[PDB]
Structures are given as C-alpha cells and as structure tokens.
Amino acid sequence: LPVSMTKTSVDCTMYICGDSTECSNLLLQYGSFCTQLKRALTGIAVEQDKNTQEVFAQVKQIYKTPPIKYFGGFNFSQILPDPSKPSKRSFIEDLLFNKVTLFKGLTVLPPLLTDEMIAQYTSALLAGTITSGWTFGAGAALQIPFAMQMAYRFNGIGVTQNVLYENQKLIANQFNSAIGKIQDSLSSTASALGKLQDVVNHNAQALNTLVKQLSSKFGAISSVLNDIFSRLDPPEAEVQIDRLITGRLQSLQTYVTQQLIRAAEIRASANLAATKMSECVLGQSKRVDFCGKGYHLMSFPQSAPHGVVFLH
Amino acid sequence: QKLIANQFNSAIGKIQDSLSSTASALGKLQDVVNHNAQALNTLVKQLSSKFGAISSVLNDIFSRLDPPEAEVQIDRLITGRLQSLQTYVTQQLIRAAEIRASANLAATKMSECVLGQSKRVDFCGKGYHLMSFPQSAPHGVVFLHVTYVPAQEKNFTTAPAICHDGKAHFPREGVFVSNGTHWFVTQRNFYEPQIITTDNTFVSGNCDVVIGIVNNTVYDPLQPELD
Amino acid sequence: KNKCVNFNFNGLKGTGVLTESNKKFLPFQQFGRDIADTTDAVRDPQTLEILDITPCSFGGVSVITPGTNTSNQVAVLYQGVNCTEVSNVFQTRAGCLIGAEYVNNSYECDIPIGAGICASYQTQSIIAYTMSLGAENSVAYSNNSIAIPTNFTISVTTEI
Numbered sequence: 015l016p017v018s019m020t021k022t023s024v025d026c027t028m029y030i031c032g033d034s035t036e037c038s039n040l041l042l043q044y045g046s047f048c049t050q051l052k053r054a055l056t057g058i059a060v061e062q063d064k065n066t067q068e069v070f071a072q073v074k075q076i077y078k079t080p081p082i083k084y085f086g087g088f089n090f091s092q093i094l095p096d097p098s099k100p101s102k103r104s105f106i107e108d109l110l111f112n113k114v115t116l117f118k119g120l121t122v123l124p125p126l127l128t129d130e131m132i133a134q135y136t137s138a139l140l141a142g143t144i145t146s147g148w149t150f151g152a153g154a155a156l157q158i159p160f161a162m163q164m165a166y167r168f169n170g171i172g173v174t175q176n177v178l179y180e181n182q183k184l185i186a187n188q189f190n191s192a193i194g195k196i197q198d199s200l201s202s203t204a205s206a207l208g209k210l211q212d213v214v215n216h217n218a219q220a221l222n223t224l225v226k227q228l229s230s231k232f233g234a235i236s237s238v239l240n241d242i243f244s245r246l247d248p249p250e251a252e253v254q255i256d257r258l259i260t261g262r263l264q265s266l267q268t269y270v271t272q273q274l275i276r277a278a279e280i281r282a283s284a285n286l287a288a289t290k291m292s293e294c295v296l297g298q299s300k301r302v303d304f305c306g307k308g309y310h311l312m313s314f315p316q317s318a319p320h321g322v323v324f325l326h
Numbered sequence: 327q328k329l330i331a332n333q334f335n336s337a338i339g340k341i342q343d344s345l346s347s348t349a350s351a352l353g354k355l356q357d358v359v360n361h362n363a364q365a366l367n368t369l370v371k372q373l374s375s376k377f378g379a380i381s382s383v384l385n386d387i388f389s390r391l392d393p394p395e396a397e398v399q400i401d402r403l404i405t406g407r408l409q410s411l412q413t414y415v416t417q418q419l420i421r422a423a424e425i426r427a428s429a430n431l432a433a434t435k436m437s438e439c440v441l442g443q444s445k446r447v448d449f450c451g452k453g454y455h456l457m458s459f460p461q462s463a464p465h466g467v468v469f470l471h472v473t474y475v476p477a478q479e480k481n482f483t484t485a486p487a488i489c490h491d492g493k494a495h496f497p498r499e500g501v502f503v504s505n506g507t508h509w510f511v512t513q514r515n516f517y518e519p520q521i522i523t524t525d526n527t528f529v530s531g532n533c534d535v536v537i538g539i540v541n542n543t544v545y546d547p548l549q550p551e552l553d
Numbered sequence: 554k555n556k557c558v559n560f561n562f563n564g565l566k567g568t569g570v571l572t573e574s575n576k577k578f579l580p581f582q583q584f585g586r587d588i589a590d591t592t593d594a595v596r597d598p599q600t601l602e603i604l605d606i607t608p609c610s611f612g613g614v615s616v617i618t619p620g621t622n623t624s625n626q627v628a629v630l631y632q633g634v635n636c637t638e639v640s641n642v643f644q645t646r647a648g649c650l651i652g653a654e655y656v657n658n659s660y661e662c663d664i665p666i667g668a669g670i671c672a673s674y675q676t677q678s679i680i681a682y683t684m685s686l687g688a689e690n691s692v693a694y695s696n697n698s699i700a701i702p703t704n705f706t707i708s709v710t711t712e713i
C-alpha cells in the first residue's frame with residue numbers, strides 16, 4: 015500500500031522565464047498567485063509527512079528484540095533487522111529497497127522521517143507483535159511465549175487449542191517454508207511492486223511534462239523570451255509575454271490541481287494503510303479477506319521507500 | 327463498582343481541564359474554517375490584480391478606451407476572473423471530497439462505537455474499547471472513546487498444558503500461571519487465581535506429545551463429596 | 554571562468570558559471586543542450602575547447618521561528634544549498650541551517666525541519682536535535698513466563 019509521495023516545491027521566477035530581469039517587475043501586477051501555489055504544495059508536504067507518522071509511528075515505546083531468538087521452532091531471521099549490515103533492515107526489506115528505485119526552479123524536499131527511522135519503527139512493531147501479541151497495541155507490553163500466543167490466534171478463529179499443541183512442529187515447519195518462499199516469489203516476479211512504482215513514475219511523468227511545457231511556443235513567435243524582447247518593441251512584445259505568462263501559470267496550476275487529487279488519493283490509501291497496520295498487526299481482525307485471503311492469524315509489516323508491505 | 331465509577335468520573339472530569347489548557351487541541355476542525363476563510367479572501371483580493379490589462383477596475387476602461395479596443399482588455403479581465411472562479415470551486419471540490427470522506431469515517435464510527443461495541447484495537451480509541459460518548463460541535467463531531475487499559479502488571483511462571491493420570495489437560499478459558507510449588511488458572515486480561523478443576527479443563531489425548539508440559543494434580547469436584 | 558557571469562557566445566544570453574568539461578565533442582557541434590531544453594555546454598568560438606554552463610546557486614529560504622510571543626531569534630535554512638559559498642553552522646541533508654546549536658540530547662519533534670532533525674526552544678536559544686523516536690524498552694522474553702495484570706485503569710480518549 016502506498017503511503018507517501020515526492021514532496022515538491024516550485025519557484026516562480028525560474029520556471030516562467032529562468033533568471034530574467036523583466037519578470038520581477040511584470041509578475042507583481044498578477045496578484046498573489048505565487049503565495050497561493052506554495053500554500054498548496056507545502057500543504058501537501060505537511061500532509062504526506064503526517065500520513066507516514068500515522069502509519070509507522072503508531073507505537074509510543076521502542077521495543078527491542080531479545081538476544082535469545084528462539085520462539086519454539088519458528089524462524090524470524092528474515093523479518094527481524096540484521097545487526098551486521100549498517101542499514102539495520104531485514105533480508106526482505108533489503109530486497110524491497112533494491113527492487114524499486116527512483117534545475118528549472120523545481121526542487122525536491124526530502125521527508126522528515128528518514129528510512130532508517132521507519133526501519134526502526136518497523137523493528138519496534140515487529141518486536142511488539144512477537145513478544146506481546148495484542149497487549150502492546152492496547153496498552154503495556156505483557157511478556158508471553160510465542161507457542162501460547164499462537165494459541166490465542168487459533169482460539170479466535172474458532173479452533174480449540176489442542177490442535178496447535180499436538181502439531182506445533184508441523185506448523186513451525188510449514189510457516190518457515192512459506193516465509194522462505196515469499197522472497198523467492200517476490201524477486202522472481204517482475205510486477206509485484208508495481209503499485210509503488212506507478213506512484214513514482216506518475217510523479218516523474220508530471221514534472222517532465224511540466225518542464226517540456228515551457229518549451230511550447232504558446233502560439234507566439236518563440237518559446238524563449240530573450241528573442242521576443244530583442245525582435246519587437248516592448249509595447250509590441252508585451253502582448254507576447256503576457257501570452258506566455260498566463261500560459262505557464264495555467265500550466266503550473268494544472269500541475270498543482272492534479273497533484274492535489276493524487277495526494278488526496280494516497281492519503282485516503284494511507285488511512286486505509288493505517289487501519290490495516292492497526293487491526294492486522296497490533297490486533298487480530300475477524301474480517302473476511304481483509305488481512306490476507308482466509309482466516310486472519312497474524313501479520314508482519316516491512317519497511318518501504320514510499321509505501322508499506324504487510325506479510326499477512 | 328465503586329472503584330470503576332470513580333475512575334470513570336475522574337477521567338471524564340479531566341477532559342474539560344485538558345481541552346481548556348491545550349488551546350491547540352481543537353485545531354483540527356478550525357483549519358477547515360481557516361482554509362475556506364483564506365480562500366475566499368484570496369478570491370476577493372484577486373480582483374485588485376490588473377491581469378496584464380490597463381486597470382483593475384473595469385468601469386473606467388469602458389469609459390477611457392473605445393469599444394473597438396476596450397473589449398480586448400475586458401476579455402482579458404473576464405478570462406482572468408473566470409479562471410479565478412473555476413479554480414476556486416475546483417479547490418473546493420477537492421476539499422469537499424476530503425470532508426465527505428471524513429464524514430463517512432465519522433458516520434461509520436458512531437454506527438460502530440456508539441451504537442455498539444467494536445473489537446478493533448485503535449478504532450474507537452487506543453486500548454480495549456468498552457463504549458463511547460459523542461458530543462456536538464459547530465462543524466464536526468467530538469467522540470469520548472471510553473477504553474480499558476491494564477495496569478499493575480506482574481510476572482508469573484506459565485505452562486502450555488498439564489499432564490495428569492497419563493492424560494493432558496487444556497484449559498477452556500485462560501492459561502495456567504504459578505507462584506512456584508503451586509499452579510492455578512486465571513484469565514488473560516485479569517489476575518484471578520482459581521483451583522484447577524475438570525469444570526474449566528478438557529482432556530484430549532495423552533500428555534507426552536505436548537512440548538514443555540508440567541505434572542500436577544487436577545481436583546475433581548465430584549470426587550470428595552461422593553466418597 | 555568559475556564565476557557567475559553573463560555568457561553570450563554568438564547569442565544565447567543568460568547567467569551561469571563556466572567549468573571545464575571532460576567529454577569528447579564532435580567538431581561540427583557549436584552548443585550542447587541537456588534534457589528538457591536547457592543549454593549545458595557551449596564551446597569557445599575562439600580557442601575551440603568545450604565548457605559546461607551550470608546555473609547559479611538558488612533555493613528556498615526557510616525561516617524557523619518559535620513565535621513572537623516568546624522570542625525574536627530566528628534561524629535561516631537554505632534548502633538544498635551547500636553554504637561553503639554564500640552564528641553557528643549546522644548542515645543537514647535538506648540544507649545547512651544558520652543560527653541554531655546542534656545538541657546530542659534527542660527530544661520530541663516540535664518544528665519539522667527535515668531529514669530526522671527538528672528544532673525547538675531550549676529555555677534562551679534555538680536548538681537543533683535528532684528526533685527522539687521513543688524510550689527503549691527491551692521486554693524480557695521467556696518461554697516459561699507470562700505477565701498478567703492485577704488491576705486496571707479506565708481511560709477516556711477524545712477525538713475531533
């Protein structure tokens with residue numbers, strides 16, 4: 015599920031004419047459009063940073079993993095972070111981060127919460143969903159063994175607890191073989207993370223269409239303004255520069271408006287991601303085909319550059 | 327019940343102390359009013375712009391320029407103002423879709439937290455949800471989500487099952503806890519030690535299959551009265 | 554060279570610095586254009602070697618204030634500008650902040666700057682810090698132990 019986007023900020027003077035002296039005296043009669051557009055883009059920038067905090071910072075206390083990593087035959091080495099690599103991410107998240115990768119007055123603002131702090135929030139949530147079950151999401155963390163924690167997962171879906179205690183070594187071997195085949199099927203698939211990529215590619219397609227849009231002549235003689243001021247009289251070429259300025263300001267506001275719809279799209283997906291973090295990981299959901307296809311047992315979140323991955 | 331009631335009135339009584347001290351606690355519904363009030367004043371103050379024409383007022387250019395030339399600057403000001411009015415409703419249409427999506431979130435919350443009990447952990451407030459109480463607002467809704475948080479925790483020695491008479495024993499509700507040299511049963515969310523009987527346990531198969539099982543007696547309540 | 558000057562090589566007037574390049578251009582090329590119609594390199598018409606044209610240093614200026622009701626000290630942040638070129642100096646990933654001390658005491662994020670660094674009021678001077686994510690609590694996990702609470706508190710949480 016996608017959580018956040020690229021927070022962009024656009025300048026006024028370098029986008030329209032690119033370091034010219036004529037624009038600083040001519041754009042001030044147009045009103046306060048340059049105040050209005052930066053209120054919208056910085057209004058996105060605090061909004062999308064709020065969504066990643068509403069998804070990943072749901073816990074208050076940072077839980078640490080115990081050094082004795084034995085949970086009754088189960089193996090969580092592929093989801094707990096690696097102390098050997100300096101990034102402190104797991105094997106899947108290193109596969110997740112390497113599978114997907116990524117002036118004219120357009121600048122890029124980096125997010126506030128960096129990726130190692132999202133991975134530290136992912137490590138705190140993975141330590142909470144293993145050592146405590148539902149108690150870390152509803153209050154203080156109570157220690158509980160994982161074999162009896164899965165008995166709480168089994169009793170909620172309607173099977174009584176004697177089935178797990180007779181077949182614990184088969185369930186522990188079935189889950190470790192399943193989680194080993196997850197990263198094998200994820201890397202072999204070519205369009206498994208296409209949802210995070212089309213978020214990146216659409217925002218990449220919006221800005222390259224925006225910088226190609228200045229190259230259009232807008233019905234005038236040329237698209238560069240140095241030739242317009244030199245070839246014609248300044249009262250004769252004032253109608254040509256105002257043909258370009260309203261053409262580029264409409265080009266920038268059309269870029270602002272469709273970005274406001276896409277930011278409202280992913281924020282609605284991020285609130286969808288915020289509950290799917292809460293009901294699946296921090297608790298147990300009795301829904302049908304919500305936290306994965308079938309009767310929900312547990313979930314494990316993983317970090318992402320601009321999204322979230324749940325192992326339901 | 328005397329402890330639960332005074333904990334409830336002390337919790338609902340400190341809400342007026344918390345909301346009056348924190349003036350930015352009700353900031354979230356006021357930015358809905360502040361963004362609309364800033365947008366209309368932006369729409370009002372945009373008329374002071376000339377839009378590249380001779381003047382910002384349109385009555386004087388009808389009075390100064392001739393109608394062969396004056397409708398050229400009028401069509402510049404009309405297309406500038408019609409683009410100003412079309413964008414203002416379009417930013418309103420995106421904002422009204424956000425409030426309507428928040429309204430259905432408010433509509434499903436009172437349908438699930440007020441009219442009934444929701445078992446989701448952080449939907450009707452943080453913690454184990456018991457009930458909730460909505461309150462009125464000028465342009466929104468304020469929910470008082472009553473939750474259940476545990477406190478005064480204590481560690482105990484546990485076991486998955488108990489072998490007795492060559493047979494395993496699994497509890498119906500709760501788990502087995504211990505002090506050391508004794509074993510009792512209690513529920514999960516509360517500590518209530520009880521003597522282990524056949525009333526709250528069930529037998530299924532032998533006991534040498536369960537990993538880490540402890541040996542203890544199970545007092546049958548029909549045994550000493552019949553003997 | 555290496556100064557923000559106005560360049561005019563048979564037309565193409567603008568503002569930008571001139572640096573030595575490394576590519577091997579074809580002899581019939583006069584001025585090179587980068588992606589999305591920006592002039593990258595114009596060769597010298599006299600001495601016939603090639604030089605790139607890089608635009609001047611620009612970026613957004615963000616003024617971090619704690620409010621007029623508390624103090625009047627501010628901190629200016631140049632977004633994406635290395636301030637080796639144009640009183641304490643702190644460089645972050647988003648840009649270098651001027652006017653705030655960097656402390657090792659990690660606290661809660663009051664003013665979001667970017668890249669895991671926030672600012673707040675000390676109380677006297679504006680400070681810069683890494684955001685404290687929360688207190689560490691290593692749960693003593695054991696396969697023969699359980700924690701069960703003896704009492705409970707009822708909390709009522711508000712929502713708008």
Ligand SMILES: *[C@@H]1O[C@H](CO)[C@@H](O)[C@H](O)[C@H]1NC(C)=O
Binds near residue numbers: 084086537538696
């Ligand atoms: C419990 O954990 C300890 C330490 O990890 C281990 O030595 C012991 O064998 C475990 N016992 C069982 C029954 O799993």
Ligand SMILES: *[C@@H]1O[C@H](CO)[C@@H](O)[C@H](O)[C@H]1NC(C)=O
Binds near residue numbers: 087088089091
């Ligand atoms: C978990 O998997 C790793 C990798 O194969 C292995 O080295 C380790 O022994 C496994 N641990 C358990 C408890 O199966």
Ligand SMILES: *[C@@H]1O[C@H](CO)[C@@H](O)[C@H](O)[C@H]1NC(C)=O
Binds near residue numbers: 481693
């Ligand atoms: C149980 O809690 C007490 C009090 O904090 C502590 O002293 C003791 O070491 C704990 N025992 C275990 C086995 O965790």
Ligand SMILES: *[C@@H]1O[C@H](CO)[C@@H](O)[C@H](O)[C@H]1NC(C)=O
Binds near residue numbers: 505506507508519
């Ligand atoms: C556990 O501690 C001692 C062990 O001798 C026992 O007397 C006591 O009654 C037990 N606790 C409870 C609550 O029964």
Ligand SMILES: *[C@@H]1O[C@H](CO)[C@@H](O)[C@H](O)[C@H]1NC(C)=O
Binds near residue numbers: 598599600601
């Ligand atoms: C122009 O003259 C200078 C000095 O005589 C010489 O170095 C340079 O190569 C000449 N350029 C051309 C294109 O002839």
Ligand SMILES: *[C@@H]1O[C@H](CO)[C@@H](O)[C@H](O)[C@H]1NC(C)=O
Binds near residue numbers: 622
């Ligand atoms: C400054 O703070 C005081 C005390 O809260 C308050 O009475 C006053 O209105 C504030 N002034 C401004 C301009 O916010």
Ligand SMILES: *[C@@H]1O[C@H](CO)[C@@H](O)[C@H](O)[C@H]1NC(C)=O
Binds near residue numbers: 637
């Ligand atoms: C920024 O300037 C410092 C000081 O000269 C320099 O050491 C550093 O390499 C520069 N960083 C970049 C990215 O150019």
Ligand SMILES: *[C@@H]1O[C@H](CO)[C@@H](O)[C@H](O)[C@H]1NC(C)=O
Binds near residue numbers: 655656657
């Ligand atoms: C932070 O720690 C570094 C490394 O010990 C030290 O050089 C620096 O002075 C410290 N800064 C503060 C504000 O204590």
